[PDB]
Amino acid sequence: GPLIVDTVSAESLSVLVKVVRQLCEQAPSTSVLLLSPQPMGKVLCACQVAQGAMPTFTAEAWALAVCSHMGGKAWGSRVVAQGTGSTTDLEAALSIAQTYALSQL
Ligand SMILES: [Ca+2]
């Protein structure tokens, strides 16, 4: 299943979650994690795991892997999750997100 992992502009976590949901619905085999930088070094995270994915791949665990790296927190379910953190290293956050997904798919 395809994978979208990216850093994007968004005005709120609610918008970010809704964008993730629409991407997953428009291409239902896809799993998606978006990170959105915000002021003061904060970064928002929203993700969603495709319904067809391997059962060991859960959204909460994915978000936690990324947000814990960013000194933050995550919450959610096996299907959708969110979190926040702060970081100056978007490349590292993206790499954790992509490598985690590839290891669980
Ligand atoms: Ca499957």
Residue numbers in the entry: 881 to 985
Text from the published report:
Consistent with its absence from primate mt tRNAAla sequences, the human mt AlaRS/tRNAAla system was recently shown to be insensitive to a G3:U70 identity element. For the human mt AlaRS/tRNAAla system we show that loss of the G3:U70 identity element was accompanied by a radical reorganization of the recognition mechanism, away from sequence-specific direct readout in the acceptor stem to sequence-unspecific structural readout of the flexible tRNA elbow. The appended C-Ala domain, which plays an auxiliary role in prokaryotic AlaRSs and is dispensable for aminoacylation in the human cytoplasmic AlaRS system, plays a central role as a folding aid for the intrinsically flexible mt tRNA elbow. Fine-tuned induced-fit adaptation selects mt tRNAAla and rejects non-cognate mt tRNAs.
The model suggested two major contact sites between mt C-Ala and mt tRNAAla. One is in the C-terminal α/β-globular subdomain (aa 873 to C-terminus) containing the glycine-rich “GG” motif. Thus, adaptive evolution of the Hs mt AlaRS/tRNAAla recognition system was accompanied by a radical reorganization of its recognition system, moving the center for tRNA recognition from sequence-specific (G3:U70) readout in the acceptor stem to C-Ala-mediated sequence-unspecific readout of the tRNA’s elbow structure.
